[PDB]
Amino acid sequence: AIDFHLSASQKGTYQAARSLARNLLMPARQTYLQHPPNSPLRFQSTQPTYAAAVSAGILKGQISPAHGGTGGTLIESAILVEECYSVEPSAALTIFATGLGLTPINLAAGPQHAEFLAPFLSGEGSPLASLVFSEPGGVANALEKGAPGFQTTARLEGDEWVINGEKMWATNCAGWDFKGCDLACVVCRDATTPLEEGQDPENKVMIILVTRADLDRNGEGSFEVLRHVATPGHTSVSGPHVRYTNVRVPTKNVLCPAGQGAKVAFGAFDGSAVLVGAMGVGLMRAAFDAALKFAKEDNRGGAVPLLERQAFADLLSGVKIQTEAARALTWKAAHAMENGPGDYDARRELALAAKVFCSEAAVKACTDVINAVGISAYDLQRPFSDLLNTAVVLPIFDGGNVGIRRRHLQQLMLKPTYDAWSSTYG
Amino acid sequence: AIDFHLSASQKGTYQAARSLARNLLMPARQTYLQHPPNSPLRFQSTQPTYAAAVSAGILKGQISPAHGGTGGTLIESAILVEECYSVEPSAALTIFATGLGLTPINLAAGPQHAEFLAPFLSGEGSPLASLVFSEPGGVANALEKGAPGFQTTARLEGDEWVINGEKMWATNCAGWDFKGCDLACVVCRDATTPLEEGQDPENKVMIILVTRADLDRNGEGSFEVLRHVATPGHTSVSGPHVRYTNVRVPTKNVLCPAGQGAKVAFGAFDGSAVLVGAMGVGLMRAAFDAALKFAKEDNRGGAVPLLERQAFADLLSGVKIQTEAARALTWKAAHAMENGPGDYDARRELALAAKVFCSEAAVKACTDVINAVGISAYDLQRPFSDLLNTAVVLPIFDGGNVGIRRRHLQQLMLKPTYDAWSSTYG
Amino acid sequence: AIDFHLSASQKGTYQAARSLARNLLMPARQTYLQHPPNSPLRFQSTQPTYAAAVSAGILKGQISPAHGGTGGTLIESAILVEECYSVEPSAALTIFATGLGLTPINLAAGPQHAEFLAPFLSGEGSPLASLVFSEPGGVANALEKGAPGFQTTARLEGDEWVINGEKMWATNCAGWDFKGCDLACVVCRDATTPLEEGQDPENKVMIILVTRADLDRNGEGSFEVLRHVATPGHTSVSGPHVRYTNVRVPTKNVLCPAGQGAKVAFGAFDGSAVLVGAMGVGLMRAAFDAALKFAKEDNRGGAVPLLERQAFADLLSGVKIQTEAARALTWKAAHAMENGPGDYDARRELALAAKVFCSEAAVKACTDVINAVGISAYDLQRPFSDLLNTAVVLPIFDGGNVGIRRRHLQQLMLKPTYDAWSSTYG
Amino acid sequence: AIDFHLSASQKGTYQAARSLARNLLMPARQTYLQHPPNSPLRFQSTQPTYAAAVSAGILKGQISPAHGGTGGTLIESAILVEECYSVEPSAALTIFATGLGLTPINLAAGPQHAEFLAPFLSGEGSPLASLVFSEPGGVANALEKGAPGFQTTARLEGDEWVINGEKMWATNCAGWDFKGCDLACVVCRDATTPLEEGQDPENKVMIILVTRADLDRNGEGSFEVLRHVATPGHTSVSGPHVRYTNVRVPTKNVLCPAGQGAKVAFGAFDGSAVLVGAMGVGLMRAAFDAALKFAKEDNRGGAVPLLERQAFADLLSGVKIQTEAARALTWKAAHAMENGPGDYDARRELALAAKVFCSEAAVKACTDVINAVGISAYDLQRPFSDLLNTAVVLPIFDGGNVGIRRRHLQQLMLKPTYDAWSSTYG
Numbered sequence A, B, C, D: 001a002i003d004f005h006l007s008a009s010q011k012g013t014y015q016a017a018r019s020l021a022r023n024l025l026m027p028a029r030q031t032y033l034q035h036p037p038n039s040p041l042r043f044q045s046t047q048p049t050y051a052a053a054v055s056a057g058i059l060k061g062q063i064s065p066a067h068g069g070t071g072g073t074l075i076e077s078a079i080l081v082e083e084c085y086s087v088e089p090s091a092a093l094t095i096f097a098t099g100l101g102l103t104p105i106n107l108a109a110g111p112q113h114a115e116f117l118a119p120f121l122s123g124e125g126s127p128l129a130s131l132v133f134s135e136p137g138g139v140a141n142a143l144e145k146g147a148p149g150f151q152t153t154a155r156l157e158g159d160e161w162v163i164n165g166e167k168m169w170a171t172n173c174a175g176w177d178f179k180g181c182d183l184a185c186v187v188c189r190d191a192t193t194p195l196e197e198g199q200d201p202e203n204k205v206m207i208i209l210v211t212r213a214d215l216d217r218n219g220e221g222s223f224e225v226l227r228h229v230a231t232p233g234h235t236s237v238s239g240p241h242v243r244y245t246n247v248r249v250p251t252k253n254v255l256c257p258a259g260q261g262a263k264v265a266f267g268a269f270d271g272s273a274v275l276v277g278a279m280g281v282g283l284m285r286a287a288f289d290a291a292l293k294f295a296k297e298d299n300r301g302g303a304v305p306l307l308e309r310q311a312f313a314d315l316l317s318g319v320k321i322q323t324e325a326a327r328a329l330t331w332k333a334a335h336a337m338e339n340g341p342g343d344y345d346a347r348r349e350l351a352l353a354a355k356v357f358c359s360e361a362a363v364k365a366c367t368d369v370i371n372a373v374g375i376s377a378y379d380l381q382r383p384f385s386d387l388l389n390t391a392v393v394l395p396i397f398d399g400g401n402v403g404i405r406r407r408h409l410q411q412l413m414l415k416p417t418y419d420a421w422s423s424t425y426g
């Protein structure tokens, strides 16, 4: 039955989220601010915060009970993500990115993959996982007929899969010391045999695990950071341009065989679309809160309070309205992904809707709040610039809206089985 | 606990709504279409349909069980309103307006007001009710200090209240024969004693009941239609410019005494704000459905299916995303209004949000699908033009966004007790 | 030398436009309102107006001096169109549609075509022209490799061309008495010899003249009015669904040989794009004027003038700003089309820009003004609803923004010779 | 005569602007980039290239011919500003800000003021001027009845004016060495006698010159930089929070006596509004060019060029359209400000319009281009982030759109003399 009240457990999640952001993430921010904005040392300095998160069981919660994890719901994740993004986006993302890295494992792992999950179930240390998908040259057209396909390839040679390629933007993939993370899910193209004339490129896509142990065993030059990328927000996040060279792994490392990889990757990106929605809600909440606090304490030298000016008030209420719509849609999507109604195609349309709606609304909200607050918002002592520069990544990352998210919505509607309102009216 | 599944009762509401719309409303439209677009004969011709709806208990459903009715939840009203607006907005509104007319009684009735509700609990005939608020000269500033205030006044003379003034836009107020509807809740300004220097005009606002009976007793010309207004949509809806001249009623007709009328009127308007949200969702659904249908069956003489144009698909998926957000927000507001969490001030901000967001989103969606369908959509054989001309009213009526709904949002934020997210997180 | 001042002549053009609109167009409106909105005899009552326009040399002005006319500049046309659309769009469009019909003749006519312009150069009566290009099944994809192409076809049987096809939306094509207009440029597909395998469907496109004399000559059944298309705006304009059956004409009637018709059609559409911009400017001007007028006389019962409300004033000034941008862009495109400094590609990018910017701005302006004016704008006694219903056609007619106008912009930019700012800086 | 062709003198200005930007501004950028992002040394490091611009005659060009300068038309200024902003906004703004500082003197100088202008007319050194208006507490309400008014005050004590107050954001006011620029136009309120009951605060507003020589004469503590403000773009621009303490100047230093200052300051801001339009155009051009460059050399791993994606193309053409409207509007305002037709009030409206339209269109263009380019736009190696962070200042600076520019538009429309289209057709 239609209910917007948090359960006692969901309220616990909210309170826990508040404490995590306040006690772990805020100190992480003061810590990385001690290094210049283009320094990879920002990322490295967050390792002790990450460890503290690990000790509190965050990584265990990112693994499904099927695999021995404690795993929660997308709804609970959405609540956590909103709160963290309202406080400290960059340090939070490093943690959420490990969750993304572990998602393909939740979706496709079998019993033989348990050994790979062990470091993450330990409840100690600071292991990092990464979903290693994107490439320097772009991947919006990795599955397009007539195109080159993924640049990163795997070849079965004897009893070993051999990986070669360059990747970029894959959060966490280089690990704390830039020599490779604990567990990478590398999305690549099987090239043991050539793509046949007219064959669907998706038939060749795999996901193969690569651990830090694999890289070490393969020795010098097997993994290399080609370029650290400085970004205008998320300054403690590390997703460098990297290269894998002749990285040989055992057959047990294959997660998704050729022809099953794309589906699992997009499956992982469906879940994260929901949390990108939550990211947007969190930034919008932070923007509204900061603008409202500005108004309530600063009348800009006027004869009346700032909120008594219709033009200012209407900008703020506009943001509040979009934020409330964004959270409702995000929760609807989080609920539907795990409960229906509607088949998977219908559930996924909502996750994509949340992603697209909230990411763009977050950018618009940030720009509106800047105009409302006025010239003061150009002062970097105030939070407004960082908010905007955090928001603008939402539409373009986790599968950009223009080149990926919207192309999928197109394919969904094209299907004969498309049933517009099934995700609502059963 | 966060849940978006419809209960059995909510599924039932939805099924009954589909039935009502297809079986009663659609025929009402075939009937009124036979009269000229700008003729009050359209409204008059809907009486048979209306009475049939009365026979199915629709009016009983607009009255709270506390007063003898079968009224349900705001959530169920949202589901009903969405479906009716997706099929036939004009015939639907005349019915919903009686519901609005009855709301102030549902909210503030005393034991002595039971007799006034009798015709509406009868289950037969075709009694009309009206919330009579708007006036030819505007009402956004009715409560504004230094302004004239309501043009409609009532003054206590002996043992009868005497009502004088002109109203406009008040749906149903003139009844089927244009000589006065069964039950009108007349909002007006006590003028028995003058507003005192600097006194809050809200102190004088009353709601007085006026029945067809009262009007008949008052004789020749106590009620007069001064002008029938022709509208581009809602053509079977009747809310003329009218005048009450020396309408004398017994003290039992007072629903809200001077200084209590404003709060009750605005309380009614908070509930209706949620349902305007639902109206917006329903038009959006109708526009998306019609556009999708067209696209599935006309490739515009193209070499591929219409949906295969990035540009066309993007307009439609844009509408879908906005509609899902609009419904999610509407249901959240519907739920919160009756369940919290948060102050009434908190709950209220969400109802206003739904009104503003969905009304404007409805107009955008209709504009978008017109562009997507193309030149064909100027063709009055298709539903698109009437969709737009219906949607355009949503932002301006039931308290316009610009001068009323946003002014209320402004005032809520201005309160020292404003607590932004209490309506979600407590 | 950059100059926005009207020359003496251009001021003359503007005064003439003002006079035409005030003395001819306004009365045409009061006149055609006497007849039904979906009736084609509303259209017939506008003849005296058209004939007065003809008397004043308007039609001679639509023909270039090369072909014996008194043709002016695109800038003067933009001035005229803006004024007319700010007053009376429907009656005005009948006149302008003749200008469009005549345009391919201005672009493509040779010595042998002089005979066809005679009725338009005589300064007598009320001859109508029409560019008959649009078909029931759409035409955005008539030029596309794989599609059924134009459904209207012409084939060379001996020494006469035989034309068969159905048409729609072609303003003016059926004449005053509905038996066919004086002069139609029929755009069609050469079905004399089948299109070759893998051949650009453009190669078979023609334009062929068809006079009322030709229709009369082919006798009964040669021209038939199938369906009259009712539209929400332009209610006095007649552009029905018609069929040409075995319409036989001499080889002199060919204006554009197979393979040349597409370029000339789009050439004509470039010119009109600029004028669609002017239409948009005109509607925006009227919307702003009406809203401003409303505000200066009606304070909506407020304690202060309506323009003292920030939210209201910002809506109005937003419209004023867009209108000024719209006109400045329209004039730039009008100037560049005939004067450079672009090459033809650069020039038409600006014409398309004007069409897209102003059409969309007009729709947005009409929506904004309705919200600003409020509930009063739903009253058909006021001009706001009609304004919206006219503007909504601008993005979709004369080559919709979505399936053609932007498709051409894309092709322009794809050319290796594209030089972004050459239309301004050389 | 409506003409969009540049004259030989305007072509000359364009060519000189290209050369100046490339030779002076680009090297300024490579120079200041050697210092940290937030360092005041970025500003200081631009002195040598500022001196080169001075030697090139740039400051002479900011002074009106009436004072011995070679200042040209606003149109030519708009051409220069667009080019400079398309190349290097930050170093450009420092130069343009000296022009703003000289503007009140161009507008109001008396014979006694020629000595103050002398340093700026020599063609050597690197003199800086500042219009010192803005204050930490805000200034949108400096003229509001019932408000505190400017915090910066001046009092006549004998034969000297004594100035006290804090200013913030006033570009260049602190000079190269942070101890005060060469020539500051300080906007302040006369506090010699108190404001009378219900008196217009405008009556007390003055502009008083303050030179570095004045500051040195007044001794230690008379001028102090309180805080250098770090900004997300314009990182070489210095407009710190500063304090003037008991700064005494002779009466010759008074530029606008009490009651004349506000009109001159706003006069300066009317001219600057046009040039902000041009800054907007320049950033839009730069964003469009950078995205087109990326598209023409990077197909994102596709089977077709990036421009063949309808999605990408539609985003770029949208930016191109807005840019053409922006420039057209800016040039119209430039021309009308100096040539009419219309009142000063009418001309003024167009300047305000260009500022509001173009500033907001620049922000929208930058966000659109980021979405089109995709994740690559988040890489600080590419120009898109810096473009956005430059663009967001435009709506909020030089008199913010929400608090100032739109309030001026509102006051214009409120005048009985308002004549909507006089600046076009008057």
Ligand SMILES: Cc1cc2nc3c(=O)[nH]c(=O)nc-3n(C[C@H](O)[C@H](O)[C@H](O)COP(=O)(O)OP(=O)(O)OC[C@H]3O[C@@H](n4cnc5c(N)ncnc54)[C@H](O)[C@@H]3O)c2cc1C
Residues within 6 Å of the ligand: A097, A100, A130, A131, A132, A133, A134, A135, A137, A138, A139, A140, A141, A168, A169, A170, A171, A231, A234, A237, A239, A393, A396, A397, A398, A399, A400, A401, A402, A403, A404, A407, D299, D300, D302, D306, D309, D310, D311, D312, D371, D372, D373, D374, D375, D376, D378
């Ligand atoms: C902070 C951060 C964290 C990230 N996390 C990860 C991660 O954990 N793992 C990972 O693998 N990657 C990660 N990424 C990368 C991110 O997911 C990107 O969205 C991904 O690289 C795809 O980028 P894109 O959508 O721009 O596609 P691209 O291929 O780069 O396309 C770019 C643009 O080209 C256009 N385009 C291309 N093809 C088409 C088409 N067919 N139709 C229409 N338009 C088209 C679109 O306009 C699109 O916006 C991260 C990036 C950042 C900045």
Ligand SMILES: Cc1cc2nc3c(=O)[nH]c(=O)nc-3n(C[C@H](O)[C@H](O)[C@H](O)COP(=O)(O)OP(=O)(O)OC[C@H]3O[C@@H](n4cnc5c(N)ncnc54)[C@H](O)[C@@H]3O)c2cc1C
Residues within 6 Å of the ligand: B097, B100, B130, B131, B132, B133, B134, B135, B137, B138, B139, B140, B141, B168, B169, B170, B171, B231, B234, B237, B239, B393, B396, B397, B398, B399, B400, B401, B402, B403, B404, B407, C300, C302, C306, C309, C310, C311, C312, C371, C372, C373, C374, C375, C376, C378
């Ligand atoms: C189909 C239909 C059904 C209706 N049903 C009913 C009904 O059942 N009962 C009833 O009483 N009425 C009814 N109405 C009227 C409807 O409720 C209107 O919204 C109501 O009259 C208020 O209109 P408004 O908001 O435009 O206020 P107005 O006072 O008309 O204000 C108009 C505009 O002025 C501007 N404005 C005025 N004051 C301010 C301010 N202080 N600040 C900023 N801007 C301001 C705003 O832009 C506002 O939009 C109906 C109307 C229609 C068309």
Ligand SMILES: Cc1cc2nc3c(=O)[nH]c(=O)nc-3n(C[C@H](O)[C@H](O)[C@H](O)COP(=O)(O)OP(=O)(O)OC[C@H]3O[C@@H](n4cnc5c(N)ncnc54)[C@H](O)[C@@H]3O)c2cc1C
Residues within 6 Å of the ligand: B300, B302, B309, B311, B312, B371, B372, B373, B374, B375, B376, B378, C097, C100, C130, C131, C132, C133, C134, C135, C137, C138, C139, C140, C141, C168, C169, C170, C171, C234, C239, C393, C396, C397, C398, C399, C400, C401, C402, C403, C404, C407
């Ligand atoms: C008042 C009025 C006057 C008119 N006057 C004339 C006239 O004088 N002469 C004449 O010939 N016609 C006339 N027309 C019709 C006008 O020329 C139409 O614009 C023309 O028929 C093309 O319509 P369209 O752009 O909707 O294209 P259509 O082919 O009808 O398609 C419409 C929609 O299909 C989608 N679409 C189709 N293909 C694509 C694609 N490849 N990419 C993206 N989207 C696509 C687009 O979203 C587009 O909006 C008139 C119409 C009106 C209303």
Ligand SMILES: Cc1cc2nc3c(=O)[nH]c(=O)nc-3n(C[C@H](O)[C@H](O)[C@H](O)COP(=O)(O)OP(=O)(O)OC[C@H]3O[C@@H](n4cnc5c(N)ncnc54)[C@H](O)[C@@H]3O)c2cc1C
Residues within 6 Å of the ligand: A300, A302, A306, A309, A310, A311, A312, A371, A372, A373, A374, A375, A376, A378, D097, D100, D130, D131, D132, D133, D134, D135, D137, D138, D139, D140, D141, D168, D169, D170, D171, D234, D237, D239, D393, D396, D397, D398, D399, D400, D401, D402, D403, D404, D407
């Ligand atoms: C790079 C840069 C260069 C600059 N150059 C100069 C310079 O050379 N000289 C100089 O003096 N300053 C300069 N400034 C400051 C600039 O001119 C600002 O626009 C100015 O300080 C006014 O800011 P504001 O419009 O936000 O007004 P504020 O008073 O700061 O108002 C802030 C916000 O409050 C709200 N508000 C306040 N009052 C009202 C109201 N009455 N109605 C509605 N809303 C209201 C509005 O949303 C407004 O945006 C510069 C600033 C920067 C960043």
Ligand SMILES: [Mg+2]
Residues within 6 Å of the ligand: B137, C298, C299, C300, C301
């Ligand atoms: Mg009045």
Ligand SMILES: [Mg+2]
Residues within 6 Å of the ligand: A298, A299, A300, A301, D137
């Ligand atoms: Mg203060």
